[PDB]
Amino acid sequence: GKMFFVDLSRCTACRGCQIACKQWKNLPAEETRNTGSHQNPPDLSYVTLKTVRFTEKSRKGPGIDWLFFPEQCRHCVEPPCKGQADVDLEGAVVKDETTGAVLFTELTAKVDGESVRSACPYDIPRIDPVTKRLSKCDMCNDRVQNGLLPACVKTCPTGTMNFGDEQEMLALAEKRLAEVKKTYPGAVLGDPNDVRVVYLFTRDPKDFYEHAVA
Amino acid sequence: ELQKLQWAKQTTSICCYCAVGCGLIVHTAKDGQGRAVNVEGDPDHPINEGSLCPKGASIFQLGENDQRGTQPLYRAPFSDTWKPVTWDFALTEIAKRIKKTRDASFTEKNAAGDLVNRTEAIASFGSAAMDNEECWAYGNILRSLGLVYIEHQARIXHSPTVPALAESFGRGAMTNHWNDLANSDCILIMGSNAAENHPIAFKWVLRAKDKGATLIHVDPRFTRTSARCDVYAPIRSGADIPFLGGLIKYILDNKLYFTDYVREYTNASLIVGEKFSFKDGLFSGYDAANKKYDKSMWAFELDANGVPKRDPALKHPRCVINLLKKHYERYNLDKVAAITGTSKEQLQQVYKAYAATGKPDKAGTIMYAMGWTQHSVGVQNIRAMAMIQLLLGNIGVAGGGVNALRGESNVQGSTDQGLLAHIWPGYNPVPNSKAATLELYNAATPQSKDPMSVNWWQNRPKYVASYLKALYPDEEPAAAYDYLPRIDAGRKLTDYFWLNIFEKMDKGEFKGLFAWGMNPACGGANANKNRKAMGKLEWLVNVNLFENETSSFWKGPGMNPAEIGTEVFFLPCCVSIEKEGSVANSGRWMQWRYRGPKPYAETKPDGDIMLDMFKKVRELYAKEGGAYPAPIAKLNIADWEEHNEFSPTKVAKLMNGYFLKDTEVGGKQFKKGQQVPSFAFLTADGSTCSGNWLHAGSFTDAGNLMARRDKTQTPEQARIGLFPNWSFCWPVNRRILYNRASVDKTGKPWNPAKAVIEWKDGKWVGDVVDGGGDPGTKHPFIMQTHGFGALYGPGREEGPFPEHYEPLECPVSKNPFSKQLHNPVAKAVCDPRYPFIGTTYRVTEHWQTGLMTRRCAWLVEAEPQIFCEISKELAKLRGIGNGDTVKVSSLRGALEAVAIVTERIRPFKIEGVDVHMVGLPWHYGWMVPKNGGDTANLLTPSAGDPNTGIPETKAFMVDVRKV
């Protein structure tokens, strides 16, 4: 099926991906306050499937290393969230045979909300405290099934967001890692063989986010 | 099929925010009969390839927004409430105010009894956000009413850029275009934060880096741009000319210049007169009384014919290149490193990287937007950028140029339509009170005796004649010329500009203001003064998308409606995606866009509002009489409408122009009514009209060239990304200006691998050649009188060579280059209670005053509140922790903001004292949202620069306290 290659060595934190996700699904905006960061919304939620996380790491000499992480579901080849939800009820979490999309259905209102979150190594799922429905990045699967790019990929002007067949994307991810290493020697791939959203990190993924890798 | 888009009409549009000019696809419900259901990028568009930054991606939320104005609103003098009212009321009542104020105030002759035919009782602001056809219509409507005080956004980036680049190259325009960035071998970003302010530009900047380019960011602050460059070099505010001058010395001393390019395409060989000198930081001919220069003392030595003398051997010690060398010898690495705060090794690195592009087969480009080019030597700052590019042969070439980034989607086009006080459309000057006749007007155009100098500006009388025909085709140009108003010749040109309009308002010297697609209550420096001063207006016409801090100043903070006597009309205009027209991007790409949904509620296109309003003024004058009606009465407006209403297509065609009678011209036959093919075929004798000679070529008999969506490219075009068949750019689809400099005198490219043009089969192939003629027969800079790229530019107020004069008044007392500290042709207080340097700038997610983006929930989500960025060093000294509320204060006012403590700000060492900078966005305002904060322009002084008419927004003294 399909794979995202996300080259974080090209991200400007323009946050087009963040707005493009909400425009496409017509999601509402959260109530936000600035608390000493550009980062907002501060975390993933029921109504926010993607937010760009900002971390500042000091460096010897001028400026900083400003790390950006547009966070989304990894669409794992072997979804731990499915394994967990299939306990209470099958169908609440399904896989798309053709694309690789792990998809939450309306029947997540039956499973244990917090159970399916804990099972997720990347801490992705979020609950609606009213309806009990679980939400996350659905991979814009309907767009993909119609031969369109996911909104976040189409909107990205930098070449950070990349999408297509897992064969092509793993070739790209490997070839680009070799190129990016020349500038950022600590560049690595986020769990290339487990997931369908492969992030290129310019250094230790943990510097970007606590749950950047499993 | 996608249910969302299934029953929707798909139209194409261009982004309504920044001058990158990204393509949109719009989906409109009921197959076009109802509302937009989706807006995202146009994947076929060659600039953005369907990518949008969060401002473009949010345009659905801008359009389908319940907070948008629905109908005209009225505020009666001393009322604390809007009264919703009909279009027909508002427009009739506005036309009355116009006629009343015009009749009362109209001057037929100044004190010197010279003909002016104007009113100084009404000023207009705006707007870079309107369509080109609305901009053109508007400027001619105001001038038919006799306004002279016509300004907009452009003033703040025009006053520096246009004179600097016009002096150096003959035009003030961005030299290249966005896609061309991908062809550069070294990209220097200095006075720009393009990853935030022109985000899609970074597509091509990174494509450059993919092809081996070095990316250099030079900024006081570490931004989202810095994160993605190869070198981030910090620079203290105002230290740019030192930096640029140090680079010129580096290039000359290391002989890294393009020798053949310099010798033949620059004025390097021209002999400067013996009257030219420079000593103690003053040029020759300095008049200490009036702090003015006698520029006549900088003239060239002329030959018998009146052509400047040349020594092609570059021996003569009064050769431009030899004077240049001598001038910049003072700017050594130690002085420059000391004043910039940039390390000697980091300067050497940046200089070596960029001066490497002096290789014929390497191209370096400079990107700058606003930066700090507002002070009295910003024009000189940009001059130095031009001179560096001339030395390295980077002008006229793929991946080169001075990329002076424009701001708003159509600021390029709104300026082209002469919505500045000093220009008619096509950059023909507004005549002064001493240009009594059209012939005298024409007599000013500089002439050349160099047969190798095209000196294209000699064609002006054709353009002025055709412009006057486009307005007044019944009358002879010479006669029509007595209709439009003139400015006082015996008066400072800045007296008519942005900053002095605020002065004259606060002196109550204006009855009426049009604030048309602008938000001066927030955009103006010293907002507290500008808001007070709006009380001294009699009437106000605000045209915008939402109620705002300008429409509703009368119920502002610490205001009492009952005491305020200003009659306000608010007229709601429709959004970009609800009308048809063209916008001119930074690359001069003139792009046609279509309506998706019908205008929301009772909102009208600006074209309709201004045409309807003028129609009332007209019928009023037709039935009441009053002051000099001919210019209003006789104005050709039937060419501006179909089916009762404003026709963007027809206005566009008139702007292109057509033959009024059968004419032979250029050596070709033309039938009456033929669209004019190009400005080459306009006439001075009334045969031709053309609203704007730059648009001649844009809408021909071939059809609307701005509406082309064709990606056909020859191999040589596609290699550098010209896209000649995608829309149309002025002049006549030349995408890279000065491209004749990109080839030798045989017509062979300096770099065949990135050729722009080429002599093949006895014609020019690739780009449209910037000036006709065989290789080695014409000087390449065709709008320059002499035809050369100016290293030495003796038209400049501050001197023919850029020289460091300290832009920071308060914290600096030492100039290491001369004993002249401040600009010798230019009174801050520097109250010790305000010891830190305030600076304002932008974030990716918000637009201008935030009038637009504060109404878009998704953008407010990402950036909800005014913040204050400070170093850890200042945070420590003032006891400020990250996220704390802070008060930021100055002599002009005070506000609250959320503290951001970050290493992205650092102290600068100035004369052994650590100087702290505090950073604020100016995106916020009191009206929206709840807890957003107000404009950072409460803190900024109205004390802007005397040699520009431009405010101080990058360096103003503040205090910051914890709350």
Ligand SMILES: Nc1nc2c(c(=O)[nH]1)N[C@H]1C(S)=C(S)[C@@H](COP(=O)(O)OP(=O)(O)OC[C@H]3O[C@@H](n4cnc5c(=O)[nH]c(N)nc54)[C@H](O)[C@@H]3O)O[C@H]1N2
């Ligand atoms: N997101 C967004 N994009 C915009 C706009 C917007 O409001 N929001 N506005 C548009 C408009 S109207 C314009 S004019 C352009 C302007 O675009 P820019 O000029 O990029 O705008 P700023 O961020 O105000 O200033 C650019 C940079 O100059 C730096 N700087 C400050 N002082 C100095 C100095 O003395 N020297 C040097 N070398 N650099 C200095 C600042 O730190 C800042 O990073 O952007 C346009 N694009």
Ligand SMILES: Nc1nc2c(c(=O)[nH]1)N[C@H]1C(S)=C(S)[C@@H](COP(=O)(O)OP(=O)(O)OC[C@H]3O[C@@H](n4cnc5c(=O)[nH]c(N)nc54)[C@H](O)[C@@H]3O)O[C@H]1N2
């Ligand atoms: N402190 C500080 N002040 C600054 C600056 C700074 O950096 N710092 N930047 C300066 C600069 S470079 C600039 S350009 C100015 C800009 O300042 P303004 O021009 O006052 O900016 P806005 O009005 O916020 O933005 C453009 C306006 O266009 C309107 N608009 C959009 N579409 C349409 C349309 O179709 N029709 C009409 N009629 N209106 C429309 C929007 O509603 C908005 O009100 O501000 C200047 N002020």
Ligand code: SF4
């Ligand atoms: S759109 Fe692309 S460049 Fe912008 S924040 Fe998202 S991933 Fe980064």
Ligand code: SF4
């Ligand atoms: S990242 Fe988490 S939510 Fe997404 S598929 Fe993997 S386990 Fe499920």
Ligand code: SF4
């Ligand atoms: S793939 Fe679709 S749902 Fe997932 S983050 Fe991107 S835009 Fe949002």
Ligand code: SF4
């Ligand atoms: S704001 Fe500028 S860069 Fe962003 S989508 Fe609009 S035109 Fe493109």
Ligand SMILES: [S]
């Ligand atoms: S602008």
Ligand SMILES: [W+6]
């Ligand atoms: W601007």
